[PDB]
Structures are given as structure tokens and as C-alpha cells.
């Protein structure tokens, strides 16, 4: 009802308050991450942790989101935070395009170089992110409006196993489809097959996201046991953007 691309677009502009640290990602005791690299790895976790918090705060102020049952608000963020980081990395990484791409932007004034990815053994995923997501989005020439819409759609996933009110999550995702479709036919008008072209990035985002967890779990970086808990507190205690 109030959920719209125009609204999501202005939220995108708000800034998360001094990220009340939550250990979603961290290098812990007995890790297979060689000694000389924990410091770096750990600082990258530090960063993601910050992004996740900003993400948890974004989801909260999303029209009707907080009107959802708390159990669901949790499960939803819980199931999509990873894909949302990657999607954001890929959006942010487009500026550094143009041999395959060599720079991935994890945050403003911060980029991962392909070679670091190679040494890390994460070469493929690094490349999939930059071509399947970043390059394709540049080619597809996807704008911010479509970018926010897709975020909302990724978030509001009613297929999330465990929700107590699937219908409520559906009405919200469907309103998003309605919104995205309207945007495309009233602006991108000429471009046929666009609605599907955009939405076709989602399963791409999903495969990459899954491969990510393969690695994060392999190197014991995720605190799966505590994610839900962190989201629960973040939603309630964190401070609202600016």
C-alpha cells in the first residue's frame, strides 16, 4: 500500500547509525585461515558485520515490514542477508569495470583485487560476481530504481521455510512485482522482456550466494548459531538512520 519504488529509493539514501557491532562474521578459535591472514580476514568480517547491521536497519523501516510478525522479520533477514551483501557488492563494483574485471568493491574506498581472490582460493566466485552480476547489470543498464526494487524482492521471500505468515509475506512481494513491472513499462517502456531480464539475476545471485556459504563455512567464519539472535536484537535496539 505504502510500499513503492519511490519510497525504497529515498530509504536507500538514509544512513545507518554507528553500527552497533554484531558478530555475524568473525575469525574464531582454531581456524584453518593461516596465521598471517587472520588480521586481514578479520577486518573484512568486521566490514561485512557493519554492512549487515545497516541491512537489518534497512529492512526494518521498509513499509509494512515491521508490521510483520517478529519471527518472520527475523527469518527473512536471516535468509537473505548474504545475497543482499553480494548484490550490493556487485552494484558497487560496476564503477570499477573495464582480461576479466580485476576490482571488486566491498565498500566505498575499498576494493578487493582479483589476485587476492586467487590466493584466497576464491577466484571463481569472485569472477561470477563481477560478470553474472556486475557486468550483466551494466550491460542491462539497470538503474537505481530497479536496484532497490530487486533488493525488496530478494528480502521479501515468502518461500522462506519456517515463516508463520506466508500470506503476509506474499502480499508484500507481489506488490513489489506490481511495482517493478509498472516502473519498466512506464519508463524503460521500449525495452521488451525487461521485467524477466531483471528478475533473471535473482537465481544467479542465489547460486553465487550459496557458493559463498560454502567458503565461509569451510573457514569457520559464520556464527550460524547466533545469527537469528543478532537480528532479533538489532531490530529492537539499533538506532534509526539519518
Amino acid at each position: 500500500q505504502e510500499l513503492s519504488i519511490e519510497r525504497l529509493l529515498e530509504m536507500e539514501s538514509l544512513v545507518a547509525d554507528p553500527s552497533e557491532e554484531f558478530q555475524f562474521l568473525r575469525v574464531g578459535p582454531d581456524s584453518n585461515v593461516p596465521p598471517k591472514f587472520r588480521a586481514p580476514v578479520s577486518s573484512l568480517c568486521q566490514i561485512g558485520n557493519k554492512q549487515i547491521a545497516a541491512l537489518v536497519v534497512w529492512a526494518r523501516d521498509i513499509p509494512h515490514f515491521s508490521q510483520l510478525e517478529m519471527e518472520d522479520q527475523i527469518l527473512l533477514i536471516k535468509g537473505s542477508w548474504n545475497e543482499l551483501l553480494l548484490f550490493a557488492i556487485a552494484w558497487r563494483s560496476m564503477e570499477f569495470l573495464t582480461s576479466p574485471p580485476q576490482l571488486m568493491c566491498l565498500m566505498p574506498g575499498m576494493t578487493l583485487h582479483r589476485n587476492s581472490a586467487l590466493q584466497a582460493g576464491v577466484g571463481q566466485i569472485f569472477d561470477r560476481v563481477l560478470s553474472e552480476l556486475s557486468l550483466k547489470m551494466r550491460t542491462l543498464r539497470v538503474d537505481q530504481a530497479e536496484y532497490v526494487a530487486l533488493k525488496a524482492i530478494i528480502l521479501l521471500n515468502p518461500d522462506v521455510k519456517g515463516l508463520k505468515n506466508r500470506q503476509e509475506v506474499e502480499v508484500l512481494r507481489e506488490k513489489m512485482f506490481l511495482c517493478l513491472d509498472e516502473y519498466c513499462r512506464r519508463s524503460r517502456s521500449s525495452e521488451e522482456g525487461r521485467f524477466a531480464a531483471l528478475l533473471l539475476r535473482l537465481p544467479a545471485l542465489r547460486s553465487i550466494s550459496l557458493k559463498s556459504f560454502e567458503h565461509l563455512f569451510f573457514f569457520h567464519l559464520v556464527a550460524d548459531t547466533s545469527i537469528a539472535g543478532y537480528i532479533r536484537d538489532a531490530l529492537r535496539n539499533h538506532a534509526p538512520p539519518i
Partner: protein, 220 residues
Amino acid sequence: VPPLTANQKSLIARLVYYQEGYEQMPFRQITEMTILTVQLIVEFAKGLPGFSKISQSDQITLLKACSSEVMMLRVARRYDAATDSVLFANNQAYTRDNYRKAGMAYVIEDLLHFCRCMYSMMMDNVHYALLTAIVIFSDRPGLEQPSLVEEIQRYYLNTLRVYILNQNSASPRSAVIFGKILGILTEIRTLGMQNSNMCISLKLKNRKLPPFLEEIWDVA
């Protein structure tokens, strides 16, 4: 409400037609039945307008990657609401029991949830058929000609779109129906992975996977 071009209608007809003709100790069963259907899938795929325009190694790239995902669709497609389970002409292979007698029972819940979720969408055999095509022509890693495949895929994509638009009088809900269908492409990916993970498990638990699957779903 732009009607379906005689070309798209022939395409729908063609697919709905061939789909029917491709319907259908413990672990021993499953592995075999899967092979049968995996063959029905490969045949349905090869007879798909556009499969030929594509390179030979790219066909293997698609058939290999879409095999488990489309397998998930097949099973899901035979979910009975009344008995809340999969009535796959019950070779007693895709049932909670056999999957238990076969060990891999944990996987059942994740599968059923998808069944429940897909069932609720209320898809036509047309919706379902176009989707199977669209799945097969998705951008998979390692395609020598991604641009081409994307070409082929877009033809099915647009057919599905027009079919829905006509079926709903250009109703706004069209994007909703069309949208949820493309949404399955995403959930289908996680299931495929889970399939892969199981294979990797049999590997470090040394289980017998008939060379057919051993090849189609890799081993390295």
C-alpha cells in the same frame, strides 16, 4: 492484449504435447528410477526448439546443470494435497519411507516444503512446460555461447509472458503470476546445490552412484 502469434501457440502446443509423453536395497531403487526420468528430461530437452542452434559441449553444460533442478520440478509436480506427499505413481522410491530406508530422510522435509510451495502457485501444464524449458535454457557457468542460450531462453520467456497476459486480459496481476514463476528458478537453485552436496557426501562415505549419475552430476 497482444494475442499469441501462431508461432507461439504452436510452441505451447508442442511442449504440452511432449510433456505428457514423458511423465514417468532402497537407495538401489531411487538411483535407477532417477536415471529413467533423467533420460526423459534429456529427451524433452533435445526436442526443444533451439537446442540444436547450440554447441555440443554447451548442450552437455545445460543438460548436466538442469538435470537435478528439473528433477525437483517433476517430483514436485506430482504432490497430492490431500495426503500431503508425493504420489509419483509411487514406485515407493520417492516416499518418506524409502528415503528413510535409504538413509537420506532428512532431505524429505526440504523437498516437501518446495512441493507445498510450488503446489500453491496453481500452474497450468503450459506454465509448467514453459518453465521446464526456461530452466533448461538458463545461463549456466561454462557456456561457450551464453549470448546464444540467452537468445533461445528469451523466446520461451516471452511466450510464457504473452500466454499469461492473454490468460488474464492484460490484468496487472500478470506481472505477479509471471513474477512468481520466475521466482521458482531461484528456489530451484538451492535444491540443485543440496543435490550436489549429497553427491559429495556419498563420495566421502563411499556410496554407489551408477556411472550415469556419477558422470552427469560430476565427481571430481
